[PDB]
Every structure is written in structure tokens, then in C-alpha cells.
Amino acid sequence: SHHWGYGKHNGPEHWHKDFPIAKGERQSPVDIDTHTAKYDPSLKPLSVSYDQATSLRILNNGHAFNVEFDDSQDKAVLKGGPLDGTYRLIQFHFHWGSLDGQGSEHTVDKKKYAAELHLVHWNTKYGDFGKAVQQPDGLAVLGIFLKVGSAKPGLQKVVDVLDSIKTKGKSADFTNFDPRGLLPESLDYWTYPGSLTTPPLLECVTWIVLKEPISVSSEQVLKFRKLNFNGEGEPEELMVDNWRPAQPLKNRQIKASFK
Ligand SMILES: [Cu+2]
Ligand SMILES: [Cu+2]
Ligand SMILES: [Zn+2]
């Protein structure tokens, strides 16, 4: 299923016609009301183990750009916190705005950040990603907010390759990239059960959203905004505002790892 996007004629308000789960019981993103989130002393320490991460390639897929990892072994994994067992990193990507005052998917007391990073992991008990996305605990996505201020040195290698993947369907080698350079100092987080935030909107995700944003420079985010939704030789449509707004919380509680 093709043709969904972020424009007025195929954006988030239309997705439910082809993806009825868009109106489901555990859709993402959500607004994080920080005063209603409750500290959960049962949460375990989160473990982000990216030392042996093996990046492979960066791809413009027409919706965002994905940095892809070799997930054929436990090389980069997420464990602990709300999670049972081991989740393997498969890709990361971002969502961002046309302006610094919008771009994130999750919001914090209705505050929109300039962008949001998603590090996507699948539960190794299900053998591969495709089977993991048929399970209610198949995926874990680590979300990190971006605000505009000082430059993030560990983002710059990503920014510098974007020129080579301007249009949909372009890819480039992207080996030897260390995703640890994209994390904030603190691993304090909020967690809740949700979904993919793009079609097919599957309800498989344990969301882990870090409280501390990373700072990126205006120049870094401006380069995200030079990408294109369209393919080569087609009319240019800047890749901006590729975020889904907050969805109803319904019968969910957001838990905090910190007091
Ligand atoms: Cu289709
Ligand atoms: Cu697509
Ligand atoms: Zn995402």
C-alpha cells in the first residue's frame, strides 16, 4: 500500500481509510503529560549496548532517511527498563519540521521539539523483524528529542551524506558510524505501549522516550530540510513536516523511570 504521505491530500487525517488501525486503542505518538506520568520503582535500569553496532547504509525512502544496521547477530541491543529480553537495533531515522517550533511526534506537556530521533529495535525471541511486527511486544523504539542550539558532533557525519541521497530511492554506503554519539547524557525516560507512527501503524511497540533532549545546530537541521520526498526528475517537494500529531491516549498510562 502506496500513496500515503504528509500532504493535505494523503496525510495523517487520511491514513485511516487504508489503515483502519489508525483509530485503534494503542496508537502513537502521544502527548506526555509530565504531571500525570507516574514514577515506577519496578522499572529496571535501561541498558543501551551499542559498542559493536555495525552500520551499513543510508536510504531516502520517500518518508524519511533510514540509517540501516546489520542485525544478523546481537551486535547492538537494547535491554532492561520495561523490556523483557533482548531487542536488536535494525535502523534509526528522524522526523522534523519546516520550522524550529515543530517536528517532533511525541510532545511534552504539549511542547513540540524541532525533531525526534527513533532508534528501532526488534525482539529477538521472534527471530526476525517481519515476525516481530505480528506481536504486541515485537518492537522497542527509543525516542530522543532534538532542540536547536549547539551542534551535535556525532550527528555531523549523517548531515554530511545527505547531499548524496537527496531524492526518494537513493542510498549511500554508511559503514563505521557510531550511534552512541546521538544520545544525551541521561537515560531517564518515559514509557508506554504504542504503535508505529507511519503506515501500517502496527500496534507492536514499547515506546521509551528520553527526557533529556539533544541539542543540534540550526545548520544541521536546515540540511535535513533540503531533502526531497520526490524521486529524481520529479517536481521538488521538500522533505519537511514528516511527523504524525499526538493521538488519543485512551486506556493507557505513561510510566516514568525517574522520581
Ligand atoms: Cu498501496
Ligand atoms: Cu513507502
Ligand atoms: Zn519514526
From Swiss-Prot:
Per the record, its GO cellular-component terms are: apical part of cell; cytoplasm; cytosol; extracellular exosome; myelin sheath; plasma membrane
UniProt binding sites for substrate: T197, T198
**What are the Phosphoserine sites (modified residues) in this protein?**
S1, S164, S171
Q: What is the effect of changing H63G?
A: Impaired activity, not rescued by 4-methylimidazole (4-MI)
Cite the pH-dependence comment.
Answer: Optimum pH is 6-8.
**Localization, UniProt:** Cytoplasm; Cell membrane
Tell me the impact of changing T197 to S/V: Reduced activity
* Resulting phenotype, N61L: Reduced activity
User: Which effect does the record note for changing H93 to C/D/E/N/Q?
Assistant: Strongly reduced CO(2) hydrase and p-nitrophenyl acetate esterase activities, impaired stability of zinc binding
The alphabetized UniProt keywords are: Acetylation, Cell membrane, Cytoplasm, Disease variant, Lyase, Membrane, Metal-binding, Osteopetrosis, Phosphoprotein, Zinc
Chief place where the protein resides: cytoplasm
Question: Where is the site Fine-tunes the proton-transfer properties of H-64?
Answer: Y6, N61, N66
- Impact reported for E105D: Normal CO(2) hydrase activity
Q: Which cofactor does it need?
A: Zn(2+); Co(2+)
In this record, what's one Pfam family?
A: Carb_anhydrase
The cross-references to SMART domains, in alphabetical order and at most eight, read:
Carb_anhydrase
Q: Which SUPFAM superfamilies match?
A: Carbonic anhydrase
Residue numbers binding Zn(2+): H93, H95, H118
Catalytic activity, as annotated: hydrogencarbonate + H(+) = CO2 + H2O; urea = cyanamide + H2O
Q: Where is the active site?
A: H63 (proton donor/acceptor)
Recorded family membership: Belongs to the alpha-carbonic anhydrase family.
Q: What else is known?
A: Target of drugs used in treatments against glaucoma disorder and breast cancer.
Entry protein name: Carbonic anhydrase 2
